Amino acid sequence: LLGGPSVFLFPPKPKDTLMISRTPEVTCVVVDVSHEDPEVKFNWYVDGVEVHNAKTKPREEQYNSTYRVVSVLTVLHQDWLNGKEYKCKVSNKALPAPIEKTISKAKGQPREPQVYTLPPSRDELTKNQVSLTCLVKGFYPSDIAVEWESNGQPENNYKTTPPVLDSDGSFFLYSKLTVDKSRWQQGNVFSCSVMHEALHNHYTQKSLSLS
Amino acid sequence: GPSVFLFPPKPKDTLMISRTPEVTCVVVDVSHEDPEVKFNWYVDGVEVHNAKTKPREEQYNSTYRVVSVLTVLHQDWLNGKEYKCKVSNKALPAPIEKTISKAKGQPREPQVYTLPPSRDELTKNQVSLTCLVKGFYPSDIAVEWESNGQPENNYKTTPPVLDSDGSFFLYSKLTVDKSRWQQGNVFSCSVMHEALHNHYTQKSLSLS
Ligand SMILES: *[C@@H]1O[C@H](CO)[C@@H](O[C@@H]2O[C@H](CO)[C@@H](O[C@@H]3O[C@H](CO[C@H]4O[C@H](CO)[C@@H](O)[C@H](O)[C@@H]4O[C@@H]4O[C@H](CO)[C@@H](O)[C@H](O)[C@H]4NC(C)=O)[C@@H](O)[C@H](O[C@H]4O[C@H](CO)[C@@H](O)[C@H](O)[C@@H]4O[C@@H]4O[C@H](CO)[C@@H](O)[C@H](O)[C@H]4NC(C)=O)[C@@H]3O)[C@H](O)[C@H]2NC(C)=O)[C@H](O)[C@H]1NC(C)=O
Ligand SMILES: *[C@@H]1O[C@H](CO)[C@@H](O[C@@H]2O[C@H](CO)[C@@H](O[C@@H]3O[C@H](CO[C@H]4O[C@H](CO)[C@@H](O)[C@H](O)[C@@H]4O[C@@H]4O[C@H](CO)[C@@H](O)[C@H](O)[C@H]4NC(C)=O)[C@@H](O)[C@H](O[C@H]4O[C@H](CO)[C@@H](O)[C@H](O)[C@@H]4O)[C@@H]3O)[C@H](O)[C@H]2NC(C)=O)[C@H](O)[C@H]1NC(C)=O
């Protein structure tokens, strides 16, 4: 059947690179591997230097009669943050040439996010739920983790915008936590948690409660 | 390719009768050799003719790029008509059909909340004025800022985000000089959406 494999290379999750105890991975995924010749070879390189510790998963047969193969390379936190490049080379006999993809952290000088919490608009207080907002602005690169909590337990009902390119070339985002107004008006404290490589200890919190 | 990408009207254009909303059929990867593509255009299956195929354009990767733009009735698009592009060539065995329409479902009125700058932000030369727009459906929307019926230029708006009830929200951030905020200038966030009365509403923001 007619057409060739495709390769997708996926970065570590932002929170994985930023905590020593978690385990950051770069994932190389090959799809549309021939049903007939499904042998694939992965070579990995860190800054053009070949490495041998990835773990390639057994091939998965798909219902559209192709295979999908995935190799996971576990990376050192410091490496990814120090901007190394991760190259996946995929070879297969049905392929006139190997397919190479590279991924690294975005280029540029990191910048520290500014975290501001904003209470509910006056007008929202007629409603039974209100929006507590966290503005995180001025950061670089865009790889960031945002979450909300109260009383040491995370909150269940928030949404976070993707990062947006600002005019000075830094990124911003907003996270919206929705809570029942009684909780806001009872005076409970909510906190917006931000992890970004350019924070001290890779972490910062801002709290928000009614006067 | 040749690949075909079909694109909806900008939101502002379908909500105002004097503007011209159009769906656009973009074909990329047209050979260097055979840049004769034809476009066929159906509205809810029925062939229409007012499409206008732009001049055949060339690209860096030895490749051509061809665009047909079809004008649509405001009310057709808002009524959920389906717009189909059929793109024909030798380059491919059989013709390629793309269709788009408005997202389906009961439109819902955006709620619009202006929030002033965080007290912590008042240490900077510039402060962020925030417009929260939530609760709206479909995701098609336009947001602008003004002060003294003049457009303000220094704003960025997030894309729509799918919220927990299946409505969308977004935030728009306007950046102004601090002094402008403290002198008590009124700033206003304006929103255009199908589900608003007259398709538009504004909300204002000043020092208290
Ligand atoms: C040779 O060089 C050529 C030019 O350099 C190059 O052409 C490029 O080809 C690729 C495909 O290989 C094409 O990529 C797609 O682009 C879509 C976006 O088009 C936008 O955005 C980009 C940049 O931001 C612009 O360059 C585009 O021209 C275009 O501008 C928009 O244009 C419209 C109308 O003209 C305006 O009205 C808009 O204002 C304007 N946008 C703005 C403001 O910037 C993009 O959506 C495509 O994604 C979809 O298709 C992919 C398939 O390849 C899927 O992976 C992906 O998921 C998307 O699929 C869709 O997913 C959506 C999300 O859920 C769904 O809603 C859809 O249903 C779903 N459809 C599916 C399944 O297909 C994709 O990125 C580039 O745009 C094109 N560049 C140009 C100039 O057009 C050639 O590739 C080069 N040849 C090669 C390969 O060697
Ligand atoms: C036979 O069946 C196959 C399986 O159904 C089909 O395979 C599919 O092939 C298409 C390519 O045509 C791939 O499309 C790519 O998807 C990328 C996103 O992949 C993530 O998200 C999807 C759904 O959200 C998910 O199923 C994937 O598993 C993958 O998940 C992530 O996985 C990594 C690694 O495990 C993890 O660390 C991430 O968190 C996790 N994310 C999630 C949400 O789970 C896109 O990135 C790709 O986009 C790039 O390339 C485009 C060009 O194709 C381009 O337009 C974009 O702009 C961008 O650069 C791309 O869209 C599917 O991933 C693949 N699916 C699977 C299951 O692996 C196959 O197509 C079909 N064959 C035929 C002939 O029909």
Curated annotation (Swiss-Prot), chain B:
Record PTM text: Glycosylation on Asn-61 is required for interaction with Fc receptors and ability to activate the complement pathway. (Microbial infection) Deglycosylation on Asn-61 by S.pyogenes EndoS or Endos2 endoglucosidases prevents interaction between immunoglobulin-gamma (IgG) and Fc receptors, impairing ability to activate the complement pathway.
Phenotypic consequence of residue 1 to A: Reduces the affinity for FCGR1A about 40-fold. Abolishes binding to FCGR2A and FCGR3A. Impairs ADCC of virus-infected cells by monocytes. Decreases binding to complement component C1q. Decreases complement-dependent cytotoxicity
BP term (GO), one: complement-dependent cytotoxicity
Location of region: CH3: 105-208
Cysteines engaged in disulfide bonds, as pairs: 25-85, 131-189
Domain of life: Eukaryota
Coiled coil feature spans: none
Glycosylation sites: 61
Keywords: Adaptive immunity, Cell membrane, Chromosomal rearrangement, Disulfide bond, Glycoprotein, Immunity, Immunoglobulin, Immunoglobulin domain, Membrane, Secreted, Transmembrane, Transmembrane helix
GO terms under cellular component: blood microparticle; extracellular exosome; extracellular region; extracellular space; IgG immunoglobulin complex; immunoglobulin complex, circulating; plasma membrane
Keyword Transport: no
Medical condition linked: Multiple myeloma: A malignant tumor of plasma cells usually arising in the bone marrow and characterized by diffuse involvement of the skeletal system, hyperglobulinemia, Bence-Jones proteinuria and anemia. Complications of multiple myeloma are bone pain, hypercalcemia, renal failure and spinal cord compression. The aberrant antibodies that are produced lead to impaired humoral immunity and patients have a high prevalence of infection. Amyloidosis may develop in some patients.
Subunit annotation: Immunoglobulins are composed of two identical heavy chains and two identical light chains; disulfide-linked. Interacts with FCGR1A; this interaction mediates IgG effector functions on monocytes. Interacts with FCGR2A and FCGR3A.
Protein name per its UniProtKB record: Immunoglobulin heavy constant gamma 1
Entire-sequence positions represented here: 120 to 327 of 399
